[model samples]
Target: EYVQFESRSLLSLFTVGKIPPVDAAALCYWGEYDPEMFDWSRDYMIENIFENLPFWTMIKQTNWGRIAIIALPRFVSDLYSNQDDAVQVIIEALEMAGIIGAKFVSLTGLIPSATDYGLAITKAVANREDLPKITTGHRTTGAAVVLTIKKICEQGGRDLSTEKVGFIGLGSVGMNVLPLMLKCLPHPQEITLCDVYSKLEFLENIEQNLVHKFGFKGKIKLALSKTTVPQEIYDSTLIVGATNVANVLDIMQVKPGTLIVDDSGPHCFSVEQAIKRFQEREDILFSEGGMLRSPFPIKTTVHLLPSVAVFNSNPFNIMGCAFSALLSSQFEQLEPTVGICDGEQSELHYQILQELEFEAGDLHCEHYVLPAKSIANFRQRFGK
Candidate 1:
């Protein structure tokens, strides 16, 4: 039987340093465990794990009595010097707890040597022969959002030929989105780019490749300067933000009717500010990359996975949703499967729901409200 766990208040999950014992038990079924232990991860999981809690609280107390679907630990470098050490320690720890049948799933792009540990875990699991093999799939969520935007332009009577697209932040998501957008859109009239670091040489090479190799004929402008305000790109019709900087709404001076897509996750824009601007503007359209509303409850659970690559060979909603779903399914009883914010308005969420009608089998789900106090407390607990 599938049991649905619901918390009475959002704060119940967000309160820092207050790991409710019941919450910990519920998490085991959701596949939510954080081993990042990096500066940021420390700041994010304080409430879920006990504040300044011993590491054992996570592996032993919270994750006990359940099959752990461990992801490739982000801090694998700190855990072991060699792949053999990493595998040995993880397996030994699980076996000590009598969790010999737990599965360890590794995502694509993880270090190849980690595959040996995954294979070893498969042998230990009771349903060894029935367990599915992990496979490489879809680009990151940033790539999926870019493809969706391009499709919207194609079908919405909007011509990219006249539009100018500006991308802020040139990190992994931005880099992936840049090429995909160029490939899908009608060659735009102009493309303006900016990044914290001066990646001029790299941008120049990409521009040249797009034009010479891919026959792209659009104007390419790269900006090395960083500006906090959005007025600099006010004339742009399409704006894509993938930066980690906070309070992006300060840059809302862009063209009044422009389309803005944000994939920066939680730190991008505050939900309060986004709602204010969206309520005041009718011409502007704001679409979040992962904030899809599905009729099926199952969609809510796995919507964050990178499944699009599996189904369509295209990185779209399916990719993010699929990846998240697979992880949640595997660890359904280990941790709280928190949905990362995708920075879109509620209306877009509704629109997505309309497009993908809910099925009877869909898991009915609700969004968790993360208050500022809870986040601030979590960060403070880690001294961040």
Candidate 2:
């Protein structure tokens, strides 16, 4: 089952040489195991194996916690070209992720290769051409998104069946996650939706279909573009910022004690504001979302700093993305089966947080060593 600990809480558990809970995990050998896939020229297996991934790759973990990274091939020749290729990419990825273990996986980046748009190609390729084999009749990478939703609720002790659930931004991410909300929330008192007018992007019809096909018949509200934000969204104890945009929030805009989870993009809590709150020694929180466990969970550590402090300094590096992918690998079987994150079927990807986890692989950051003290200086110096 998926556990929805506050992203910061999970991160708090991570770092400090603490290994996140990665049960049975094995990447697609990424040539690391393959004598052929290995880049003998570069004298490194990790980078080469990763770049050669079948377009988008997925990480699936068994209930036993065994994990496997599966690769889906794609055409990287164009953008906005073949939408079908994208769908096949997700379906196959989901299939592979599930066939392994309980197979939990999350798609962090779902866009197609250089093509940006297209479906998988089934016809055979020329003798010398490079192409990925397409798996037809496959869709919805997994069994259900309900599993992830319910787990998130369970971990947070939330009664979505009665509590208020608000979603900000209805882009690909928002709209897709909305179905999970609708299906699992049962009969919530309030359901709020917000998005910039133009940001609706491509999920318009899919949104309607999801609500009509699976909506639990909850009361609904809408907010778009700046109209001072909806009271429903602002007051919601459980809010999801699903927009692909970032740095849109102001300081302390969310209610205190509100559990705001950002599923995509960044600055859902507004980084600068988080720094300000920390400088004032306030307990404001901004979770990077999806932190692995290791070094053993501790009440204190050296990098004792705000959740976003390192994130802010390091930015969203590839390793962080990859780390998220690894962490999400265990839920594929129970969550969205098709590996669809945004609207329609699509893949998601992120690196395994190479930067935050290590510094040139040896030196540890002060942030972990002097949690309050170290981060406090960062908060102070960062403040004006």
Candidate 3:
């Protein structure tokens, strides 16, 4: 016997946040859980023991399928310190999901950051026949970010060909976004790549590829050291964040009339900063990138673990990565890219987004929805 949730109004179910559909196709995701709220002991030994193991936070009946949200009792801050142990825990969770008949798995939050963009977990389970297919969820997420950028630019009438653009953090998602930006946007005047760690040779290869493949004539620069923010970032009219790290950008330092598109799971920009900027600095417009508005509402119940609600601000919206995984599960031929987002996967995700009628929806800074008037004001100031 399976638990059955009634098909009802989207608004009604959204308020109470309960129930699950019976016998729906299962899609599991490895999302981060807040360790601060997780209780180690609740006057019971067995219950306390279960705290250390993987647990279910939410299982929702989405338009695509029944998605199960799984978490490994680990916080984002601690995963990097014990990556070896973290990988083992993730393997256990994946095995649990596989045994439960989940054919597709999406990795999110700091899970990808700790697992080398999911390559570590994939390599560990390579020879195993029992495990489900894995992806970091960077492909469609990157495409979504690119789409947002294009939309904002078109609205503001800002020509990418004449603007200086800066990219913060060149991790797996960032790497995926770079090529997509090149392919999608008109060749920019100059591009600055900033990260705490990026080899000169690797960047040179990237630079050469841009020149040969995309006919990019922009001057390419790097800001790779740990102690400094790229001066170019401050000067650029557009900036994008693709790192898994939090608060990577100094919001006050950003120039007026600049547009920021961020795809980082933990968010390189803070909500408080976004609020402050919105109230005081109206010239700067920020949009949380890689988000999609589904045609049908997805039911979510996260009462047991409220901290994990960061994954979904609204029932109608889905992260691009998670949505991509659901799409992959629905269409057998569409395999997700693990560890990287290549040119082929990048374009494929964009086409799929268009074909499936997924939209960028309203612009937001965390849960704070941008007002229509604010966006109009921004466009009037920055637009041609």
Candidate 4:
């Protein structure tokens, strides 16, 4: 990696429109082929940064992205996977990001409980005084999907506020989305929840907490059995699959125009399975489930199946890189950002998006990105 700039003495990294590449993020690990090139030493890596000139020429290239966001594993089939060093591996990897001139580190695919592991890895990277600021994309994606659906529904004259809603998986991403979702659908008819662990308290919390916030009295029904999704007008659903079981919700048939977020990754249920059941229900909007008829070549998509556009990744990933820039600014005592982004982290999540002047236009899926009016409406509604 080669890139250089006279590490500006400015307190923060660059901003979006008027500043420099102060917004860039970085990675420390390289290919295994070069033994010495992979030094984990603090000064050793920075020393390489000091020497790598070509890496600097490539700097100032991109406008938004600058860091390598990471999410971790499935299981331990290998010795390395079985080892505990991976945690330390992430910790060291981040330190290199700082030395390599990254303002901060961005994180994705992180489960809620694992935030501690990330905090340990990111400590001392931002300001060299405090913990390295790491942001999660869970809430951002939740926001993106929910907002996109809301806008899509409105433009098409579909009223989601009166529909029966369902949710599969009530983990971090699910809970994070729920509150924001309440803001959009202030009066949904009902919502059913299904989770293998049976965390009944989660539903109760939503009932007690978010009801007043969104003014929605939708009953949070807990499925008595995990085998099936609650029936009787369980309209649109968002899948945040974190389970090892397959086809958890496939047992039930859905109605037409029932938007499935497609968080189901086959480990939950294949995208292919979603269309087969729904193909009989509605004409295809975008195809991923592989069972629908499209207007143009049968467009297919689910909550999010990546494309090369956003690097086959979630659109909210830009937040992590942006947060890294905020961290850089924090390192110099420049900006006063609220918190490291995790969906459940609450108001701060949206605050960060708003601060970046983030708009739906910045997000995309397999077919279309959010429209300009939708982006404008998002800002108008959220802005104070």
TM-score of each: 0.49, 0.44, 0.83, 0.56
lDDT of model 4, residue 324: 37
Error of 1 at 277 (Å): 2.5
Evaluated at residue 75, the lDDT of candidate 4 is 18
Best by lDDT: 3
CA-lDDT, candidates in order = 0.40, 0.37, 0.69, 0.41
Q: Compute the lDDT of residue 371 as modeled in candidate 1.
A: 37
Q: In the order shown, what is each candidate's alpha-carbon RMSD?
A: 14.2, 13.8, 5.5, 11.6
Model 1, span 162-268: residue lDDT tens: 77887776654565566666654567788877665456777677678767876768777766545463455566777777664545445456555565566554435
Q: Write one digit per residue (lDDT tens) for candidate 3, span 197-277.
A: 546666666778778886778888776646446566788788888775677787888878888888876677676887788
Error of 3 at 146 (Å): 0.8
Order the candidate numbers by TM-score, best to worst. 3, 4, 1, 2
Ranking by lDDT: 3, 4, 1, 2
Residue 292 C-alpha lDDT in model 3: 79
Q: lDDT by residue for model 2 over 150-193, one digit each (tens)?
A: 43344344566765667776544455456544543465667666
Q: What is the lDDT of candidate 2?
A: 0.37
Number of the top TM-score candidate: 3
Better of 3 and 4 by lDDT: 3
